[model samples]
Target: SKGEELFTGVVPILVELDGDVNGHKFSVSGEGEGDATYGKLTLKFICTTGKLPVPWPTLVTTFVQCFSRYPDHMKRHDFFKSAMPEGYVQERTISFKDDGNYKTRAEVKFEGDTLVNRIELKGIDFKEDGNILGHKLEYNYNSHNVYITADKQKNGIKANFKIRHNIEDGSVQLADHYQQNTPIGDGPVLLPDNHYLSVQSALSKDPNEKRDHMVLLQFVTAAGITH
Candidate 1:
């Protein structure tokens, strides 16, 4: 809960991650100089799973790259085909971690229009989805109501920035709807009370294929979360 004053006069931390999933080479390389912010953070990832080619297996979760090209299912994993099989091969997938090939950075366009506003505060790059576009917030004590949004428009899509907060618990309620690198299964989905949650595998089916929308990390702060 607020990490018990997590960033409240606390020595904020810098988190960096690097690793490989069954030699598939998946790495999480960042975080920033920010507060003890927490909620849900998701990374729209697209990385190699096979020979760095097609069937990249498009997925939107919270990671850089993910795929199972391994074998020798210690627990009889092969007892069930795991997308990528050994084809009876091992000690075969070269370790490229130290070969200067793993990339945790890329230039991606936003789902919104054009890039607009951005900000850098205490390392918390608060801006529009891209480089930080524009931001604004409005509130009314008379109704204990507030409205805020941070948005950008480009390529015909207006990206979205998360919004979460309460004026004092008496602010009323509204209907809503919502994923994962982790599957957040059926839930009344109590927030705050749960403090934290994760779904090892979040699944969805669009037409004839299953989709992975993994959102494993989240965040929150002075986020009227406006545009």
Candidate 2:
């Protein structure tokens, strides 16, 4: 049931600005070229306050710098921005079923229009002392979604991966991976054994100037890798 082909594939293309807002024109550009299982993704943001336009190269550098503190597997460039003045806090949990597979539960919080933070707990199964055992991980996100659904009915997206197991030595190889539209919301939910959460910021604050302004794109995610 999980691997069934349900939705059409939608590729995220480069973004462009139609006009100016509040004497500033904000836009972004991105490209993702990967299969349904696993691949690479990159995104860049551009902003101008009218007087001096931020160079494209500078914008790209700034975006990359923001994620420099994060570990490799947890870093992502795709994002969505909103002009609405709202923030939120939420939680998510994932558990495994008897089939040895797991489901995820997402508890969401929204303030006006912004998503402030989120936490995710997951359970992971492994072999301990020649017996099946489990471990857990928690991931946090304070990040933004550049392609958020306008309808509240939509949940978070999904990425797919295919793993090959070697019965001889108990090794695994990951092949063919792609992203999916796995929406999450309030209803009967699924939880995973091993999990993590990521948090993000809707707005940015300048320390030197001591002012809070819309950065067009400002967010972060923290992941706890546990065993």
Candidate 3:
């Protein structure tokens, strides 16, 4: 009973971007839709810049006084939260198409130390075709594996790595943990015979930074997936 079959299911992933600049922080949300069995996920995002304060002088005399003080006749100020104008928003859409080759490798680092190395295959390949925030947003091969190694075992290496497939406006977690805490021992993780693997979301930057760029990923086995 060992052969190849096709596993397919509907995949909808939620994405969020959060960051802080100039004493202001903001978060933007997005979503992706595709089939876990098909290997094509299309993502949609909307970016917004909230209301910003405009500088004003008390009176003409006050403005003239400040103008005379500086040679440039004005002070410098950078409005953050989003540098764009108040109440302004932009919408974007991008598609990630897999080339049917899921053999990929991934590495996670903490403070110049390697924490995990997950080599994965038999998953959907989500390579982006355009820019999300000045760059591409897509998931690669290692988007599903979450096994940790003890090669650089540290005293406080306590962490919970979970991968979940969510849907119903993201309120429901479809199924949890296709994999977790399984050690490879010495070889690469093998590919499944019939698995519909696909990515849910991708981030623009790392979440470890103070002003983090985070992307919550959700992968579904989808319908038609078989062992």
lDDT of 2 by residue, 1-227 (tens): 12111111222323222222223334332222212112222333333333212222112111211121233343332211111012111221211222122122222223332122222222234123211122121111123222212122333333333322222244322222222222333332222222232323233323453221223332333244333
Candidate 1 steric clashes? 37
Which runs of model 3 end up more than 4 angstroms from their true locations?
1-7, 21-24, 51-227
How many times do residue backbones clash in model 2? 43
**Candidate 2 at 131: error in angstroms?**
58
Model 1 lDDT per residue over 1-227, tens place:
11122222212222222333323333323222222222222332222132211111111111211111111222121111121111110111111211111112222111132111111101122222211111111121111111212111210111111122122334321211111111112211111111111222222223442332122232322212122
Candidates sorted on lDDT, descending: 2, 3, 1
- Checking candidate 3 for backbone clashes, the offending pairs are 7-224, 7-225, 8-223, 9-223, 124-197
Would you list the C-alpha lDDT of every candidate in the order shown? Answer: 0.19, 0.24, 0.23
**Model 2 lDDT, full chain set:** 0.24
**Best by the TM-score measure:** 3
